């Protein structure tokens, strides 16, 4: 397992009575390099509640690996809004898309993402998608 | 989800937050509203969500889609039996229509006539189309 | 003295074009959610 002693300590540093909220499960799972959705959080909540001990956290993490993740489906998702199909979307497009569909970003999340990753007005969404799948593990 | 908001999101085809041109008219018509040609004339070059939201709130305050669609159908309810003919509607959609494949039109007819009658109980149909 | 069918046709065409939009967008929406999940992972 991915750095077992440090995962344990991060969970316990956030834990009260040996349990952490599912929101902290989300953050911890991200730090471990997993990408849970809010749908994962809801599904897990409706079987195990809003507070997880370390074992149920491990089960959560184990169900949030999302093996269906792959570059082509992610890219087709954005290319849907690309009428030219040249492979570019504007910052306005990326913002409105990401803050309107699916599990929409807050303007703060989008602004942080754009500050780090959007170098231009014309974003290559294929390379951006590849970047997003990096470091996942 | 609410119809107006969803119609904007569906007809904003490039995801840039703004409907423009014929798409605007289509988004409006996709809520069951037929803008009079002067309203179409007066549509701005583009609409963002607040613009579309205001336009639709004001319109709908005076315009009721489902009874207006019902009256449109009862124009062609010749038998006056609350029912228009599916064949007439099919080949009129095929003749005048601009957007749907013929397969799409047939799917639509099978929806409207879920019993193989060749008659469309247009009230029931309009109510089915308006959630 | 039949009347014209263009208004009914226009409205039903727009409606069903929207239904086709809603269905292809349904096909794409889970992977937008996937994109957003990876975005939030990069954002911790
Ligand atoms: Ca647009
Ligand atoms: Cl027209």
Residue numbers in the entry:
A (entry chain B): 77 to 213
B (entry chain A): 4 to 134
C (entry chain C): 775 to 818
Question: Please, what does the article write about this entry?
Answer:
Proliferation and transmission of these obligate endoparasites in their host organisms rely on efficient cell invasion. This active process is based on the motility of the parasite, referred to as gliding, and is empowered by an actin/myosin motor. Actin polymerization occurs between the plasma membrane (PM) and the inner membrane complex (IMC) whereas myosin A is part of the glideosome, which binds the essential light chains ELC and myosin light chain MLC1 (called myosin tail interacting protein, MTIP, in Plasmodium spp.). MLC1 (in P. falciparum: myosin A tail-interacting protein, MTIP) binds at the very C-terminus of MyoA, while ELC is expected to interact with the C-terminus of MyoA upstream of MLC115.
TgMyoA folds into an extended α helix with a characteristic kink between residues 801–803 (angle of 139° in complex 1 and 137° in complex 2). Both TgELCs display a typical calmodulin fold with one N-terminal and one C-terminal lobe, with each lobe comprising two EF hands. Clear additional electron density was visible only in the first EF hand of each complex and assigned to a calcium ion coordinated in a tetragonal bipyramidal geometry. In complex 1, calcium is coordinated in a tetragonal bipyramidal geometry by the carboxyl groups of side chains D15, D17, D19, the carbonyl group of E21 and two water molecules. The electron density in complex 2 reveals an additional α helix for this area, which is absent in complex 1, suggesting that residues 66–77 are disordered. TgMyoA residues 762–818, which constitute the lever arm, maintained a continuous α helix after energy minimization, with both TgELC1 and TgELC2 forming a small number of contacts with the TgMyoA converter domain.
